[PDB]
Design a protein around this ligand. Sequence first.
Ligand code: FES
Ligand SMILES: [K+]
Ligand SMILES: [K+]
Ligand SMILES: [K+]
Ligand SMILES: [Mg+2]
Ligand SMILES: [Mg+2]
Ligand SMILES: [Mg+2]
Ligand SMILES: [Mg+2]
Ligand SMILES: [Mg+2]
Ligand SMILES: [Mg+2]
Ligand SMILES: [Mg+2]
Ligand SMILES: [Mg+2]
Ligand SMILES: [Mg+2]
Ligand SMILES: [Mg+2]
Ligand SMILES: [Mg+2]
Ligand SMILES: [Mg+2]
Ligand SMILES: [Mg+2]
Ligand SMILES: [Mg+2]
Ligand SMILES: [Mg+2]
Ligand SMILES: [Mg+2]
Ligand SMILES: [Mg+2]
Ligand SMILES: [Mg+2]
Lengths: 128, 23, 137, 86, 97, 48, 122, 74, 72, 117
Amino acid sequence: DPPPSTLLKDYQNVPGIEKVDDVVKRLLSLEMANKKEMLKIKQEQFMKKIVANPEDTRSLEARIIALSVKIRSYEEHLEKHRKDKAHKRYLLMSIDQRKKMLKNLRNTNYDVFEKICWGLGIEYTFPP
Amino acid sequence: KNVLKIRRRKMNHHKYRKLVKKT
Amino acid sequence: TKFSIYPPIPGEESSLRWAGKKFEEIPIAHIKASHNNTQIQVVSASNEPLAFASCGTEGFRNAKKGTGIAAQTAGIAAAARAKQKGVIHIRVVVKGLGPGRLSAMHGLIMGGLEVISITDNTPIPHXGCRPRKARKL
Amino acid sequence: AKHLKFIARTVMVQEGNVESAYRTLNRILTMDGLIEDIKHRRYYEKPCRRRQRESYERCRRIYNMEMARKINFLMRKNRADPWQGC
Amino acid sequence: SNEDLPISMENPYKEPLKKCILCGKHVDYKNVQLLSQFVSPFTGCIYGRHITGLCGKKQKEITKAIKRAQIMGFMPVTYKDPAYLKDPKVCNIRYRE
Amino acid sequence: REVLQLQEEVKNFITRENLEARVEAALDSRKNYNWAITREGLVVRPQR
Amino acid sequence: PRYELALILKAMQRPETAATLKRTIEALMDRGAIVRDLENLGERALPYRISAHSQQHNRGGYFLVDFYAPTAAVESMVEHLSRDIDVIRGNIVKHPLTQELKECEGIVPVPLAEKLYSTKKR
Amino acid sequence: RQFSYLIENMARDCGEYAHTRYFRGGMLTNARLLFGPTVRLPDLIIFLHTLNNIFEPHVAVRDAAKMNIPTVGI
Amino acid sequence: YHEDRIRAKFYSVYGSGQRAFDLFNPNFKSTCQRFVEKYTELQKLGETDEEKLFVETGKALLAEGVILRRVG
Amino acid sequence: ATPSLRGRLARFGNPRKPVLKPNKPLILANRVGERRREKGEATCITEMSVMMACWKQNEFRDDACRKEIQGFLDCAARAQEARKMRSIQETLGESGSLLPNKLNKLLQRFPNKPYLS
RNA sequence: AAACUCCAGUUGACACAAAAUAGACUACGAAAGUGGCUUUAACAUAUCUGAACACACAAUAGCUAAGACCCAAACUGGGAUUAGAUACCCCACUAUGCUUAGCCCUAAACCUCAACAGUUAAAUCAACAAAACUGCUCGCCAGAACACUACGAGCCACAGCUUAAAACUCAAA
Ligand code: FES
Ligand SMILES: [K+]
Ligand SMILES: [K+]
Ligand SMILES: [K+]
Ligand SMILES: [Mg+2]
Ligand SMILES: [Mg+2]
Ligand SMILES: [Mg+2]
Ligand SMILES: [Mg+2]
Ligand SMILES: [Mg+2]
Ligand SMILES: [Mg+2]
Ligand SMILES: [Mg+2]
Ligand SMILES: [Mg+2]
Ligand SMILES: [Mg+2]
Ligand SMILES: [Mg+2]
Ligand SMILES: [Mg+2]
Ligand SMILES: [Mg+2]
Ligand SMILES: [Mg+2]
Ligand SMILES: [Mg+2]
Ligand SMILES: [Mg+2]
Ligand SMILES: [Mg+2]
Ligand SMILES: [Mg+2]
Ligand SMILES: [Mg+2]
């Protein structure tokens, strides 16, 4: 996970954010935000690492990355809430949706499919 | 609609459960 | 001053008096109007029992206890014993929707007591214990 | 139990008129729904039975309020016949 | 063509939409005085929107605020705080004949 | 504009330095959240 | 996030109340909170009798503490307030000023539902 | 009924016929039984009001078409 | 009609004229219609602003002796 | 204001489950119900108990209960004449709201039209 | 009538139970379900369709083990009624309803109306119900009864569940 001192995605590109008081830097960091703000930082790191245009969010690559971050958040939730059947359903459906995305990406752009698998650590498997 | 079809199934099931209990 | 149906709040300065006593000092007549009986207890403002009467203690039995005339008789009996101890004005607190809900209050008035206020305290759980199952009649 | 006493559901008697005070109290408990609530709680109403009763009472309100609105709308027409004989 | 023909446009005589008495105001669970204006004086029961005249959004906010204020120790449950009995009567209900 | 506003508010926050002074200042003041509404939609602040 | 601590303290004299507020604000700071303000709502009579720490209370001092804290600090602070004998009741809610009220255009009227039954003759 | 008197006078003045009253079942479709086997029906029916007093079409509109009588109507 | 916007504003500012409509006269002119005609004349003289063209019309009628009591 | 009926019934196009399950179509009839016959309260029952109270204390001797017997008699006569007038006034005049018969005649003239014409 | 009579009423202290009013609102969730308060996490998918069995769920009742127990309550016991009363009515009390950990996998699980896209014109349409249709896809159906059955197979299920016939019979259902 990103360090707690990481600034929110909205206040990371405001001019002069490095010269404010330390208290102001805490109030604008991940430490003082909910987990959803931390996931937006994780999603941004994967984009710059993998996709060619980190600003295009509608490409099949960005969608696989966005969904992979949601999948990891469901796995962390279920590690603490093992009888939460609702989120167990959301996890299994999200894994199925990502596999369908990967299938379509493997068929259309193999070079991008290989970089996604390496970047996200996904081991593609063929169905039975 | 009447429940005559249900009633036939009702008695069938009652007699079957009673037969199983008896044997 | 116009009449106020809201009771005087303790701690505030009200001008209402009853024989020189404030609303907080008037004895209380607790009426429990059940479906099959009516019980009346008169207590002082300090919770000192002054008189008790029910349809059962007045010689009524079985279905006759669950009537208005039985509750009226119990109200007269409680008022008689309370009036001997120096009670004139009372605050009525009634709980239950039994047949002796209003009749018990008439008996208290017929017995010589003056009702200055009426309060309902019928227990209503806000969600509580599950009541018994419905009857097949 | 933990609240102050002689505030809730309390009505003061005026000029010894205990009957009018009791009717005021009964009208208060009725309008706030406490009377019908107490009666329905004497025996347990099963959930499916409560849902059926609520649906029946809601359909009755809609019908009664629409019939009342039509009666008030047509009441002006209850005047005398202006073209008697034709 | 013809100058006297009607023209297509929005109703100019259309009256502005009506607003509830709380439209645009913040409902706080600490403002017990405001919350008390929507409960019964005798039983503390919350009034329905057909009595309070509030819109759906504010009827919900008032309801949630009352339930919060009651269990957090700000507002009584079984009656209306007598200190607020002389506030403006905004609800449509009368108990005395 | 939100970082500037926040940078001025932090000056008035409570710290371990002014904690004892800010507690005494709170015991001397009163904050009132009560106000009533009228049938016309007007706020009626409390008489204080 | 930004929270609001509704604090009802036992009716005490000024010195003991100041010691309780300081002890409570420090408990927030020890858990990583940034305390923003402290408001005194005044001492009043409780809406109902409250029993807390083997004692019955009829009056209390109402105080508010606006502060920021990590999400994990709330659960730990709730446990701390449960053990302080001078606290009658303490609740932590998300600060109401963070929730921005959406604009309202007014009341949109609802017309009587139509075509609920076929127009055949009955 | 507001114009019954006006219409009856207009019909009498132009030398024609008026029926502003309650319309009995079969005045047109059963006329030979109601009036006689040699009765002559109207060649034209003019409705100054095509609705009856419950806001439904006057029964004579349908019955005029059944008897193949042309109708003028406001 | 275009003039309906002028009428809606006139009724909101000056309310319905205390003068009574006479719908039997086919050539009746109300205070609002007299306001609409003056408003239209001034608009044909080049003026295009709305808020300004509405205040000048009221002055012209007052000079002619018309009673315009603002509702608020 | 009448409660809404939008999206309350099980219909095609309404996704949600039904809110209402009316056992009769929600369509206004062309008549109202007949007012139910009501049971009045007993009159002079207070004077009746006062009379029967003196009897119990005077061995049912009418000579000692004249004032109580007379009061119960006068009340019964007054309650008799009032009962005689309540019919002439309330049954015939139709005070306040109309009677069902008269109100149904008014609905006959403006029947509900659940069909097209 | 039985039952209780360490009973009842007022007052005070006092839940591993249940959640008046709001709700005349019609929201959330895949469905089952979800209406006391707070906080944390959190409600898949930028084409659609796609499974008795794969994968994950699934009211109530029920099973196994350990706890809690106000109230309710199958069974059972007592009282009454009756020709009889293994019922309906009254009283008492248990399994059970709750928590924890595992099972079981059913419902008139029905809004008896499959998902997605589109239409209100034509012939509007057997009847009733909740107007009539088009495109596309999956699932399912082919007289009644035998039959929520037999057999086989699978299953933590052993008086269970799922899948599910035939012979004899009738000319109707
Ligand atoms: S109408 Fe705007 S909040 Fe109620
Ligand atoms: K509740
Ligand atoms: K099924
Ligand atoms: K159903
Ligand atoms: Mg039937
Ligand atoms: Mg059979
Ligand atoms: Mg039906
Ligand atoms: Mg309700
Ligand atoms: Mg699919
Ligand atoms: Mg298959
Ligand atoms: Mg199945
Ligand atoms: Mg289950
Ligand atoms: Mg269980
Ligand atoms: Mg019990
Ligand atoms: Mg038990
Ligand atoms: Mg529980
Ligand atoms: Mg269901
Ligand atoms: Mg399907
Ligand atoms: Mg067959
Ligand atoms: Mg079965
Ligand atoms: Mg089987
Ligand atoms: Mg087998």
